[PDB]
């Protein structure tokens, strides 16, 4: 179809509306805009009304199927907003939004939400029903990596000059919440309308809170960044995050390189990886990780992630942040 | 002879009058004045921080004959009736007593129905991140579109626990804790103003235990005036400081390494006096040891948990070496290993602080 | 479950005792897994609740016989977890004491068998306590468990400890190279990795855990004579933990006694191998190695939930470093 | 005739009656005094040092007839209802019935009420940690503000179980054990107050067996005085504690010291007909050890007691160095915790004096 | 109606009771003086008598010829206490019900009148296994009771219990029994009863019962099940597996000189007899600490095994005080690890094999 990014879809929408558009991604904030400047496109087009609906297993496939051939009384034309679940459509879901692709007319502008659906899903009659004019817009969130770029274009977006030093914070305590981000460059707009945005000036109006996943703190630790990694661990420990699935992360991971380690001297780094399935943005940090880290030191992790599983699955449960956070420690020296 | 409580008698009254949060008292009167107020606030904070009282300051704001405006008036019906808590239609909602799903899609059908006095129609809910998944989720759905006269007040001591899609609906605000400073002067004002002798020791005593909000700082301000007839002196405060003590982990910690043993006798035996048992006090122990190890070797290893005795950690962490620490460690844990077996484990624990003292 | 021809001189011995009137109520029998516990109690519980006994046997077709033989007689009583877990909870044991009050409904006996006494919460074990100490009339109890010490000392304290020993040693290799086809040091052992247990050599040679020995009996071959016990993780890791660090552990103890001299050891059917781990170790990291193997298996036993692979992998890990020299090796102590 | 239990009849029923607490005391009588009454109350101490009987005290305070005066006034029609058990004021809550909201909610909806014949409806919501989180943001807003009329007295064990939202709006109030002295005062009051002899040594010996609390110390009172016949002896109470005659186990550590063998075992096989539990003997042997190193530590750790034999005391701490007392500990303790795995009781401690003996620092058992 | 031997003769006065005499006074003592307790917490090891002592306790309180430390036995109530059948005596088990609202029904149960006693008495077995819902909830009710209201408690261990309840609580603590009047106790039973029996066979039913009177019955009626009734000392032997002398001196002498060969054949033999191990360490450790006997004191040694003291003065004099002392330890560490090893046989090997490595 035509696959664009936020940045596209306010120049795509001024070429005429299509069909349908599916936002897809797993950010909110950029899944809100782009569906809060569609709305705006197709009620300066003529879309006076707008329908919400979210898929349920008890989601009422009738009301929507009449909506689509529900005409407007005193309204003339109509929008029609499908919030997709967490986990995407299944089989009963995928046709009744088939049948939905067969009842698109001229009205309808079939708005499609939710997280970014799978090559399974990729591969769907109701995805290719729609796959001759639908506008489809990825709306992931932006790494660590590309987090800076991105926050210092939306702050040149708003007329806000921002600093190094600022774009840095900003990404450090909303890393993962976009969502927060954007209100606090709108409050430092609203409480500095000079625009430079110092560091003094946002040191004095920001939060920690960043939201982070456990796979986070594991590359942190492949990076070796100690202080990165103690920051996930509060931010997850705040966010009362079980840190049953934290263990079970690192130990997955820390036992396939400890595999490679031990392989390193036989084989090749490279068709190690190959081996044992290793994805490849995540190769060149896993490589960092084996020269950096000792068989001594992999032991040692090894013993301290034991001690904590034992202390954790022996119904006590007591400050295992704190061995935790001694095996974050461990792990990046 | 009223003699009130000083917590809710010296409650905000105006905007002026609110201690600390400036960004967001200057946030608000922007909000009032030119812009168009959003839809719904949140507010996170700490414990007596002022959040309940900022929406209520809000909410008075919104409704009044003066308009919506920061600084409405004095004395007037809408600013009367919310401050007696009498106001009908400032809904005043404990998140944790209407969690059920059911209860909550009860209230959202009140949001429907036109205020019966003033303009807008106030929900204020407390601690709302203990709604329920789907009560937030019906939450969210009467917050994307609510009325042109209904307005959501939300707050929270943990935000969180709040997930992502609340930040799509409401506009944040965080209160950060109030320093000792702040504290301080609001107290002096406060005992100024009600004629309260005192010391300015006493009122840093009062605001170091605070530990940054001001209601404990009222709290214990009443405490000491209640004990000190009056007569708020250092030592008084100080002795009523110590009757709550509860740091003796730390004291001990610091004694031991200082190879001080009167001190930590002293402590133990006040520990004893306290009732505190003696296996919880010796992991804490050990706890603190083990974080005292990794701010060593690392100055992140520290959190925000810790963030009141912080100042004697790094000054732990920068003087003793890792070693002392490792038999330190080694000492307290073969002393836990061979507590239940001790006699009456007030002195095993001593015992142990015994063979700690003897790596002199 | 099924009989077992030794096993008859210790049912005689129990059911005289119970035709003369004088059984106790609660007997608690102490057995080896596969051992035959649970035939001497289904017996017993058959001939208690047979009308008219034939000679201490049941008596063919009788009504409390047919009903024995159908599974669901009224007044029988079975105490076993839910197939889904492992463990017997309160509220099992307590509809059993609250339906237990009601008279037999035949007018017999009431019968009662805990399936494993080791399995009982403590909970349970505590709420089964006062029917055990004074039952009603003509009610009897049948526990089964590998070791009594496991158990909770006021639970045994109200049962007669019965103790089924092992068959001899020569009786239990003719038994099974009656039943199995194979050398007679793959029996010897399997019977002393059974602990004389011979059900359980004959549950070690039907499955395919046996083979999976041999596999770790390769392992090892190619294990100790380069220091790479971790290649052993593949070996260990099959939902069978314990039962391979016990062949492990054992096969380390006949390595120590070939160092101590001694004419019987369990590996017979390797003895290179254990020549091997003799030569290629110090008795004193052979010492360290078994005593961690052995706390191993009694963390994988004792505690639910834990993650099998990341203690073997410890284990192992442990194991490479104190085969360096110069390490301090752990000794058993308080 | 009946002789209602200590701790029933004589529970404090004034200010002047309550033994320790002083701050808490203090408090709420110059508060009180001053009209500056909180509305939230937590007392907060280990068991049996008067929470409860403190809180029914302020509440006879508060609610005296003849007006508002700091200690429960003269006693009218109110005060003696409160001390009979009987309603005046005093709703007497369970926080473990109540842990959930949807009981914590029924008991907010019924706090705007009026009290009867009372000027206040005084709530103690005992064991208040007990409550959930739901139920503490819940009944947040009426501690916060409750009416006039109603006050809060929170009594618990441990307050870091609390929130910290809750524990703002309470006035802190921490009990601390009481000392043995003051024990052995409280006992003497008592005895005196019933007409029953007492021994100053069996009071001594009760009051060190209670750990800071009354209440134990009450029961363990009314134990000794059943051991007897109305009477309260040392050997009574000896007997009821079941601790041996100091001079046995200290003739025995002294044997043991001083590396003889014979001595050691008459002290043990006369202590054997005696009818004292090994295990004991084991503790006080290592309690007295304990009781030499704090010596060593300091002169302040003697103890007001043990002066029959605190001479004793100061020269085994003089002739022995730290470290042979830290041996002679810690082979005592390994023989304790090894104790139960021993072929019998007495054969473990004959078999620990006999290893400390062995391993003696100074003078070792001769070895061939 | 047969009985075994526990039930049967579960004590019926205070003067039936094994030992306990520290806490039969005391209670003989507050039911003559008027001085009565609404809570009594017996507290003690398996088989010593708390539910016998709280029992009686129950018996003699609500006596209707008065309250009496000697129940007559005869009367309506002691007869329905006796049996169990007497509504006033609630007996409950803490396990079976620890639940919000079976501590509401105590509570709502303990406010009416007793029905036929003078005291409606609670007699909770295993009370530390409550919730810790219902310890709190039932707090007030044990510190302040009705007037007709008493509590009894009994459990193994007060250590898990809320030291709260143990503060409103009287305490009886009840020692475990001696030798000495365990083993009169079942002389006085065999006699009473007509079973034939043998003061080596009593000596050895009470030291196998550690300190506990209802497991040294047990193991008595396990003893007349084994051996035509008759309570003999081979028949005792057999039952417990125990050996003499001889083959643990034998075993002790070939560890203490290291000879790995005579360990081995004599564990290999010892488990073709099919002995006890725990009962094979325990004989170790006993002649260990004979050993250290002779060692400290030449006239301290025993003068039943004259005929092994030949051997055992040579061993005790060519061996080291610390290297005895070792092998106790070590031989204590295995019998503690015991129950938790592979094996019994397996452990005892490792126990042995760890002790010739010195
Ligand atoms: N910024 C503030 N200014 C004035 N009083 C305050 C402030 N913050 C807290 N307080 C005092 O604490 C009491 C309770 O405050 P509240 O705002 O409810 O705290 P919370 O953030 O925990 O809900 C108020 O009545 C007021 O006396
Ligand atoms: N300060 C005290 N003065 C006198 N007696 C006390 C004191 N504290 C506890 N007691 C004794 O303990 C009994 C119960 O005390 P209580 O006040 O219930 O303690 P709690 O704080 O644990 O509820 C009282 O009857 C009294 O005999
Ligand atoms: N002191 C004793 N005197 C006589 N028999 C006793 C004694 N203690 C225990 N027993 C025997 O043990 C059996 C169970 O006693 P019980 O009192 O239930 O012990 P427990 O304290 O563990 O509940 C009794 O039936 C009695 O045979
Ligand atoms: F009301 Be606050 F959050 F303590
Ligand atoms: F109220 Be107390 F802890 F006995
Ligand atoms: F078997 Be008893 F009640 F401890
Ligand atoms: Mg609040
Ligand atoms: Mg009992
Ligand atoms: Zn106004
Ligand atoms: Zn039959
Ligand atoms: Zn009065
Ligand atoms: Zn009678």
């Given at each position: 179809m035509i696959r664009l990014y936020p940045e596209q879809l306010r120049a795509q929408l001024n070429e005429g509306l299509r069909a349908a558009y599916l936002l897809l991604g797993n950010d909110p904030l950029l899944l809100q805009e782009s569906q809060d400047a569609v709305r705006q496109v197709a009620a300066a087009q003529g879309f006076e009304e707008h329908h919400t609906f979210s898929i349920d297993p008890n989601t009422d496939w009738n009301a929507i199927f009449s909506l689509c051939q529900a005409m407007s009384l005193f309204a003339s034309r109509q929008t029609l907003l499908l919030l997709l679940p967490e986990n995407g459509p299944n089989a009963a879901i995928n046709e009744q939004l088939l049948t939905l692709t067969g009842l698109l007319?001229?009205?309808?502008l079939l708005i499609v939400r939710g997280n970014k659906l799978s090559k399974a899903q990729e591969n769907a009659a109701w995805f290719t029903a729609l796959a001759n004019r639908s506008v489809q817009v990825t709306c992931q969130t932006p790494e660590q990596a590309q987090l800076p770029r991105w926050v210092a274009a939306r702050a040149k977006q708003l007329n806000l000059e921002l600093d190094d030093a600022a774009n840095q914070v900003l990404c450090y305590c909303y890393e993962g919440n976009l969502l927060a981000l954007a209100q606090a460059l709108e409050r430092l707009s609203l409480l500095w309308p000079?625009?430079?945005?110092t560091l003094p000036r946002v040191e004095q109006a920001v939060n920690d809170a960043a939201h982070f996943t456990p796979f986070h703190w594991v590359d942190a630790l492949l990076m070796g960044k100690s202080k990165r990694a103690l920051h996930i661990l509060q931010q997850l420990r705040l966010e009362g995050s079980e840190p049953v699935i934290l263990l079970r992360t690192l130990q997955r991971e820390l036992l396939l390189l400890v595999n490679l380690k031990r392989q390193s001297a036989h084989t090749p780094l490279r068709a190690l990886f190959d081996k044992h399935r290793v994805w490849q943005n995540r190769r060149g940090m896993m490589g960092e990780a084996l020269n950096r880290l000792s068989q001594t030191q992999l032991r040692q992790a090894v013993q301290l992630l034991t001690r904590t599983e034992l202390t954790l699955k022996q119904?006590?449960?007591?400050?295992?942040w704190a061995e935790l956070e001694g095996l974050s420690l461990l792990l990046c020296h | 002879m009223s003699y009130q409580v000083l917590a809710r008698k010296w409650?905000?009254?105006?905007?002026?009058?609110?201690?600390?949060?400036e960004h967001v008292l200057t946030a608000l009167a922007n909000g009032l004045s030119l812009g168009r107020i959003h839809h719904a606030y949140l507010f996170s904070g700490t414990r007596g921080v002022g959040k309940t009282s900022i929406a209520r300051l809000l909410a008075k704001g919104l409704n009044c004959e003066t308009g919506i405006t920061a600084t409405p008036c004095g004395v007037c019906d809408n600013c009367r009736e919310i401050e007696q808590g009498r106001?009908?239609?400032l809904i005043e909602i404990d998140a944790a007593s209407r969690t059920k799903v059911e209860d909550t899609r009860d209230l959202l059908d009140n949001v429907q129905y036109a205020p019966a006095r003033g303009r807008f129609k106030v929900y204020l809910i407390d601690?709302?991140?203990?709604?329920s998944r789907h009560s937030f989720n019906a939450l969210l759905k009467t917050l994307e579109e609510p009325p042109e006269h209904v307005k959501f007040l939300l707050a929270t001591?943990?935000?969180?626990?709040?997930?992502?899609?609340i930040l799509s609906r409401c506009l944040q605000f965080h209160l950060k804790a109030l320093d000792v400073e702040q504290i301080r002067h609001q107290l002096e004002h406060i005992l100024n103003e009600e004629h309260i002798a005192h010391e300015p020791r006493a009122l840093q005593l009062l605001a170091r235990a605070a530990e940054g909000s001001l209601r404990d700082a009222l709290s214990l301000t009443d405490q000491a005036i209640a004990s000190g007839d009056g007569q708020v002196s250092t030592q008084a405060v100080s002795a009523m400081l110590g009757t709550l003590d509860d740091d003796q982990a730390l004291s001990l910690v610091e004694a031991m390494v200082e190879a001080n043993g009167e001190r930590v006798m002293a402590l133990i035996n006040e520990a004893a006096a306290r009732g505190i048992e003696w296996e919880a006090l010796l992991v804490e122990m050990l706890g603190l040891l083990h974080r005292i190890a990794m701010v060593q070797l690392?100055?992140?290893?520290?959190?925000?948990?810790?963030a009141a005795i912080e100042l004697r950690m790094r000054e732990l962490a920068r003087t003793i070496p890792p070693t002392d620490i490792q038999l330190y460690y080694q000492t307290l844990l073969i002393g836990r290993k061979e507590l239940?077996?001790?006699?009456?484990?007030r002195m095993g624990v001593e015992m142990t602080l015994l063979r700690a003292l003897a790596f002199h | 479950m099924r009989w077992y021809p030794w096993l008859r001189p210790d049912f005689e011995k129990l059911v005289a005792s119970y035709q003369a009137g004088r059984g106790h109520h609660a007997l608690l029998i102490q057995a080896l897994?596969?051992?035959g516990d649970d035939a001497l109690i289904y017996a017993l519980s058959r001939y208690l609740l047979c009308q008219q006994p034939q000679g201490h046997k049941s008596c063919g077709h009788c009504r409390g016989c047919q009903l024995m033989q159908a599974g669901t007689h009224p007044d029988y009583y079975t105490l076993a977890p839910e197939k889904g877990k492992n463990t017997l909870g309160v509220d099992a044991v307590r509809e059993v004491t609250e339906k237990l009050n009601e008279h037999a409904r035949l007018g017999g006996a009431k019968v009662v068998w805990?399936?494993?006494?080791?399995?009982?919460?403590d909970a349970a074990a505590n709420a089964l306590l006062k029917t055990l100490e004074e039952p009603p009339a003509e009610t009897w109890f049948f526990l089964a468990t590998?070791?009594?010490?496991?158990?909770?000392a006021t639970l045994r304290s109200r049962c007669r400890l019965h103790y089924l020993a092992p068959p001899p040693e020569q009786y239990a290799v003719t038994w099974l190279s009656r039943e199995v086809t194979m050398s007679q040091d793959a029996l010897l052992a399997a019977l002393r990795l059974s602990a004389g247990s011979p059900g359980a050599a004959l549950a070690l040679f039907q499955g395919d855990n046996w083979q999976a020995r041999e596999t770790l009996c390769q392992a090892l071959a190619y294990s100790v004579p380069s220091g790479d016990?971790?290649?052993?993780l593949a070996a260990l890791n099959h939902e069978q933990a314990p039962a391979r660090l016990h062949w492990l552990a054992t096969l380390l103890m006949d390595a120590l006694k070939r160092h101590h001299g001694?004419?019987?050891?369990?590996?017979?059917?390797v003895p290179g191998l254990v020549a091997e781990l003799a030569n290629h170790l110090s008795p004193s990291r052979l010492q360290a190695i078994l005593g961690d193997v052995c706390h191993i298996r009694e963390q994988l036993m004792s505690?639910?939930?834990?993650?099998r692979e990341l203690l073997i992998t410890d284990l192992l890990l442990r194991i490479e470093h104190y085969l360096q020299p110069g390490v301090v090796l752990p000794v058993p102590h308080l």
């Amino acid at each position: 179809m035509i696959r664009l990014y936020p940045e596209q879809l306010r120049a795509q929408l001024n070429e005429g509306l299509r069909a349908a558009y599916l936002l897809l991604g797993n950010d909110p904030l950029l899944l809100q805009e782009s569906q809060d400047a569609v709305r705006q496109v197709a009620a300066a087009q003529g879309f006076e009304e707008h329908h919400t609906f979210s898929i349920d297993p008890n989601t009422d496939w009738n009301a929507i199927f009449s909506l689509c051939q529900a005409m407007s009384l005193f309204a003339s034309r109509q929008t029609l907003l499908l919030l997709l679940p967490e986990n995407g459509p299944n089989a009963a879901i995928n046709e009744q939004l088939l049948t939905l692709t067969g009842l698109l007319h001229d009205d309808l502008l079939l708005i499609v939400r939710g997280n970014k659906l799978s090559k399974a899903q990729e591969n769907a009659a109701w995805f290719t029903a729609l796959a001759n004019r639908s506008v489809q817009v990825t709306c992931q969130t932006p790494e660590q990596a590309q987090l800076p770029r991105w926050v210092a274009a939306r702050a040149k977006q708003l007329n806000l000059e921002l600093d190094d030093a600022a774009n840095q914070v900003l990404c450090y305590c909303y890393e993962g919440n976009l969502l927060a981000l954007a209100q606090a460059l709108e409050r430092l707009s609203l409480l500095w309308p000079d625009g430079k945005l110092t560091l003094p000036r946002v040191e004095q109006a920001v939060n920690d809170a960043a939201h982070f996943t456990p796979f986070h703190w594991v590359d942190a630790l492949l990076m070796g960044k100690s202080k990165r990694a103690l920051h996930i661990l509060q931010q997850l420990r705040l966010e009362g995050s079980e840190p049953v699935i934290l263990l079970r992360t690192l130990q997955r991971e820390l036992l396939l390189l400890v595999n490679l380690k031990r392989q390193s001297a036989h084989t090749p780094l490279r068709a190690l990886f190959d081996k044992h399935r290793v994805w490849q943005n995540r190769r060149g940090m896993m490589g960092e990780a084996l020269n950096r880290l000792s068989q001594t030191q992999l032991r040692q992790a090894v013993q301290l992630l034991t001690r904590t599983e034992l202390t954790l699955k022996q119904d006590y449960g007591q400050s295992v942040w704190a061995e935790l956070e001694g095996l974050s420690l461990l792990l990046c020296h | 002879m009223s003699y009130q409580v000083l917590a809710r008698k010296w409650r905000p009254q105006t905007f002026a009058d609110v201690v600390g949060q400036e960004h967001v008292l200057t946030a608000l009167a922007n909000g009032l004045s030119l812009g168009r107020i959003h839809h719904a606030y949140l507010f996170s904070g700490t414990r007596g921080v002022g959040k309940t009282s900022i929406a209520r300051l809000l909410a008075k704001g919104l409704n009044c004959e003066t308009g919506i405006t920061a600084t409405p008036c004095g004395v007037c019906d809408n600013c009367r009736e919310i401050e007696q808590g009498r106001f009908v239609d400032l809904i005043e909602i404990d998140a944790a007593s209407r969690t059920k799903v059911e209860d909550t899609r009860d209230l959202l059908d009140n949001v429907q129905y036109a205020p019966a006095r003033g303009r807008f129609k106030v929900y204020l809910i407390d601690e709302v991140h203990m709604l329920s998944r789907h009560s937030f989720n019906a939450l969210l759905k009467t917050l994307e579109e609510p009325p042109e006269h209904v307005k959501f007040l939300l707050a929270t001591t943990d935000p969180q626990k709040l997930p992502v899609t609340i930040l799509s609906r409401c506009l944040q605000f965080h209160l950060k804790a109030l320093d000792v400073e702040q504290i301080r002067h609001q107290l002096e004002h406060i005992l100024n103003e009600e004629h309260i002798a005192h010391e300015p020791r006493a009122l840093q005593l009062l605001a170091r235990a605070a530990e940054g909000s001001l209601r404990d700082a009222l709290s214990l301000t009443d405490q000491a005036i209640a004990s000190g007839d009056g007569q708020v002196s250092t030592q008084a405060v100080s002795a009523m400081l110590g009757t709550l003590d509860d740091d003796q982990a730390l004291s001990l910690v610091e004694a031991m390494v200082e190879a001080n043993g009167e001190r930590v006798m002293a402590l133990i035996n006040e520990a004893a006096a306290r009732g505190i048992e003696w296996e919880a006090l010796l992991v804490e122990m050990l706890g603190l040891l083990h974080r005292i190890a990794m701010v060593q070797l690392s100055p992140a290893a520290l959190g925000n948990d810790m963030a009141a005795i912080e100042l004697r950690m790094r000054e732990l962490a920068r003087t003793i070496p890792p070693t002392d620490i490792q038999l330190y460690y080694q000492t307290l844990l073969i002393g836990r290993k061979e507590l239940p077996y001790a006699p009456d484990r007030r002195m095993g624990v001593e015992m142990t602080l015994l063979r700690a003292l003897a790596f002199h | 479950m099924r009989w077992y021809p030794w096993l008859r001189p210790d049912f005689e011995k129990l059911v005289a005792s119970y035709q003369a009137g004088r059984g106790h109520h609660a007997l608690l029998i102490q057995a080896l897994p596969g051992m035959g516990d649970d035939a001497l109690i289904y017996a017993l519980s058959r001939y208690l609740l047979c009308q008219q006994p034939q000679g201490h046997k049941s008596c063919g077709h009788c009504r409390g016989c047919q009903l024995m033989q159908a599974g669901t007689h009224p007044d029988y009583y079975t105490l076993a977890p839910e197939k889904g877990k492992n463990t017997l909870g309160v509220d099992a044991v307590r509809e059993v004491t609250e339906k237990l009050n009601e008279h037999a409904r035949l007018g017999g006996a009431k019968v009662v068998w805990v399936t494993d006494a080791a399995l009982l919460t403590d909970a349970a074990a505590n709420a089964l306590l006062k029917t055990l100490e004074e039952p009603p009339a003509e009610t009897w109890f049948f526990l089964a468990t590998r070791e009594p010490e496991r158990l909770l000392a006021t639970l045994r304290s109200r049962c007669r400890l019965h103790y089924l020993a092992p068959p001899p040693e020569q009786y239990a290799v003719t038994w099974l190279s009656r039943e199995v086809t194979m050398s007679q040091d793959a029996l010897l052992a399997a019977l002393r990795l059974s602990a004389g247990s011979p059900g359980a050599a004959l549950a070690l040679f039907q499955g395919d855990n046996w083979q999976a020995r041999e596999t770790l009996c390769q392992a090892l071959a190619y294990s100790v004579p380069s220091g790479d016990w971790y290649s052993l993780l593949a070996a260990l890791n099959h939902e069978q933990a314990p039962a391979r660090l016990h062949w492990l552990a054992t096969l380390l103890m006949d390595a120590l006694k070939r160092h101590h001299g001694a004419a019987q050891v369990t590996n017979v059917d390797v003895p290179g191998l254990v020549a091997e781990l003799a030569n290629h170790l110090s008795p004193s990291r052979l010492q360290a190695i078994l005593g961690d193997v052995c706390h191993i298996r009694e963390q994988l036993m004792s505690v639910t939930g834990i993650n099998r692979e990341l203690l073997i992998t410890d284990l192992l890990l442990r194991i490479e470093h104190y085969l360096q020299p110069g390490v301090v090796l752990p000794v058993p102590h308080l």
